[PDB]
Amino acid sequence: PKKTIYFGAGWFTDRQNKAYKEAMEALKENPTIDLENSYVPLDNQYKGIRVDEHPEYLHDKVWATATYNNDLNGIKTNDIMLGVYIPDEEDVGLGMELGYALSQGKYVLLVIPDEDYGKPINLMSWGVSDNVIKMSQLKDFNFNKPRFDFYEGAVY
Amino acid sequence: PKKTIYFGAGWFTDRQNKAYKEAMEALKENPTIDLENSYVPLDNQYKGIRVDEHPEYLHDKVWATATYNNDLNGIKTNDIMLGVYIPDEEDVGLGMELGYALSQGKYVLLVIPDEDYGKPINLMSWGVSDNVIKMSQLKDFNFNKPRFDFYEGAVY
Amino acid sequence: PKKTIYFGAGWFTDRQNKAYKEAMEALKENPTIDLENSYVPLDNQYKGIRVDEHPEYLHDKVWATATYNNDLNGIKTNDIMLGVYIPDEEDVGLGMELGYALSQGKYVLLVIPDEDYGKPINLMSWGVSDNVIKMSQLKDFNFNKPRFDFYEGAVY
Amino acid sequence: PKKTIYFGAGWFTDRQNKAYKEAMEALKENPTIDLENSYVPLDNQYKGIRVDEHPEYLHDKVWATATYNNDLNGIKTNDIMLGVYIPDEEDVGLGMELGYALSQGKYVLLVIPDEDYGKPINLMSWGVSDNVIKMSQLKDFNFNKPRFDFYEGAVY
Amino acid sequence: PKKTIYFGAGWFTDRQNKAYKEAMEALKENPTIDLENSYVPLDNQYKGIRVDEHPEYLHDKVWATATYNNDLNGIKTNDIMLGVYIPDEEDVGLGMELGYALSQGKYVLLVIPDEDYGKPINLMSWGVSDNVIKMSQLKDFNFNKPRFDFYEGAVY
Amino acid sequence: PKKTIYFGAGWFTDRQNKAYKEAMEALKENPTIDLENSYVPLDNQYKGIRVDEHPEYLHDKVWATATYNNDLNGIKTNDIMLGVYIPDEEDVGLGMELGYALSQGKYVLLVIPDEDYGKPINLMSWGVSDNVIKMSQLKDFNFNKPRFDFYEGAVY
């Protein structure tokens, strides 16, 4: 069978975007992931109007309200909460989605790029996570048998 | 009546710590806050040990587990979720705590330093918050009649 | 001790409003109720504007969003969920609030006008309720020792 | 893939029943709906004994208890909460199921018959809903990619 | 301030009842506990009838339903979940109440008889608990500052 | 379609183990159960190190923490909470998992061996359960259409 995921990932820094690209590739090769019916924030911004390209909407309460809800809905309707984590550039946005994921009883999986694996991550991120793998493990990670496991890196 | 809070505020930078101190002072003055029974993270780390003071605990799974568990317990057993926020120094740990407090039916209140007030904040942070105020309002905020409200500034 | 409530009661009809007033009076007399800190919907509409008084807000998504959010916040931050009920004038808005209060671990208490007491109520309303009482008991109900009980009347 | 649904719909008024019939038809033609393994209240009344045809059970606490629980179970085990909504004849029953649906992290979809689309609906119904479509949109609505969207009608 | 509890403690054996009595006495002495408003199961059975005193209620679905509902209500409307625990006489009913109290954001506190303290307890019980103490500490435990902690003994 | 399950069952007593064996057999013959992708505690003990065969880990906080979380994760990621219940030898462990199952919105199914069916079970177990069948009914129980039903035995 196949499980769907919420692609929790930033797009602010270059490193964030580098991971984003590797993450999608890995997920495409994964046989237990139904990527088409999954939810990816970028591909689901309120009626195509994402602020960073046409910024009048940064102050638009309606746009913000819709985008926020669309995201929360994208987490609760999908099976796995996937968070592309970068130790040196942690995102408050992703953090909130992790805690929300917890409340929705979802398997919270964190993926750290191989180069950063080991670097101290925030304590709360360490505690909420159900497992923390290396980016290279992603493509073969079996989402049909999700299991608990401690991040073998450090906290701060 | 008086409300107890969970003091969510990072202590990882000079600005954060400045805000941390300021907020602590405002609360001691707030007639509607029982600070003596509130939960303050840095005063509840497992074994009373801070990892910055004792790096030998950086990979101690037991320390991480207890400290994490103690914190979730602080959020769930207290009335209000307080989040000292720095727009350009956003804490992923605080983000998670916002989502969890949300899951526990708590009133989420962000406090932004006066100087920083107005700066754009992460979309998800703007979403979970029930209200957001300046540091200089924290001293009088009536916690017995917590109401909802939008942030004046923008989101990114 | 004293308990705060979320005053769930429709104001869309003559009978509803009559019940609304009656209940408000009973609560002011109840020694176990802190009405001064309770949440009453009509006193917390966004911007202080009622849509019946200002129809220009009928399609205002921001007004709807804030008012809705303020209400959910009233339910979650208060002790008891009070529902003024009219068997043959059942409010769908109140129904939703019953399910949400249920989700928030709140004690759900329905108050039916003496005259209407005994009339059949919707199955789902009879289910979520923790107890249901006549309007004339509301004045003395001990909110400090909230117990469960079946409605004497029937369901439809 | 296919998602299952809880068919939340009344059967009290003629209009309610008219929508009920159109709703089922639409769902039969929908390729993303597994209608057979879904839950529909009528087809699941406690051991065939629905009150309106053999009414001694209106006062039977056991019958009411079983029917209520069977419904709540029908919502939590299925994927989508479908509510056939009629603006002029809103149902408190359906409302409670909507709020409960929320607590269970379910996608709440509302379907209003094309003739009524636009008519003001209760505020709480507007806020709980994840999306509100026209009856004619049902048959082609893709339940594999549920998304957020505001009801373009009015509130009250 | 003072905290109310839900008195979870089995009364099905000589030892259990001995612990039951002991704990009741410690609480009457505890300055931080409002026992007068706490919920004690045996004092809230439906109709005031114990099934051991009236076996004709052994298969009464209504009695079971009300009593069960009253208990869940006691857990959700009170502050602390207290669990009087006997390592070699573990109550499945108490186990369930631990998971539910956990679901309601309550502080779970196990009290083990001094003599029994140190004996291994079930893994799941050791997990949900926020803290576990000897019977002789219950008299002074500060319920206003509930903290997390591991059990000294083992698990099985 | 097929649903997955959390195999909640003890292995302490001979009778517990007798039921365990019959339970697995029944589940193998069941066409609506995807047994391979399900979760069974024994087959998932923290890195093969189960205490009862190499007991130094009874006092290992890390082992206990991991095993506990792995179990909770096994319940929330799977569809049905299956509890192999033995009236004469109830398990506190299983009870906690039942209440947790409730919080996760899972269908809670109890299976009592035919010889014991009818024997009084704990009240809390009776109330949390969504249905209670005889062991012989298991293999043909359709998990695609889970329904509510009262245990026809007694309580205590």
UniProtKB/Swiss-Prot annotation, chains A, B, C, D, E, F:
Reactions mediated catalytically: 2-deoxy-D-ribosyl-base(1) + base(2) = 2-deoxy-D-ribosyl-base(2) + base(1)
Molecular function via GO: nucleoside deoxyribosyltransferase activity
Which positions are catalytic residues? 97 (nucleophile)
Q: What class of enzyme is it?
A: transferase
Q: In which pathway does it act?
A: Nucleotide metabolism; nucleotide salvage pathway
Gene Ontology biological-process annotations: nucleotide salvage
Keyword annotations for this protein? Nucleotide metabolism, Transferase
The EC number(s) attached to this protein equal 2.4.2.6
What does the record say about pH dependence?
Answer: Optimum pH is 6.0.
A Pfam cross-reference name: Nuc_deoxyrib_tr
**Annotated family:** Belongs to the nucleoside deoxyribosyltransferase family.
Please give the subunit comment from the record: Homohexamer.
Task: Explain the purpose of this protein.
Answer: Catalyzes the cleavage of the glycosidic bond of 2'-deoxyribonucleosides and the transfer of the deoxyribosyl moiety to an acceptor purine or pyrimidine base.
Q: What is this protein called?
A: Nucleoside deoxyribosyltransferase
Q: Which source organism does the UniProt entry give?
A: Lactobacillus leichmannii
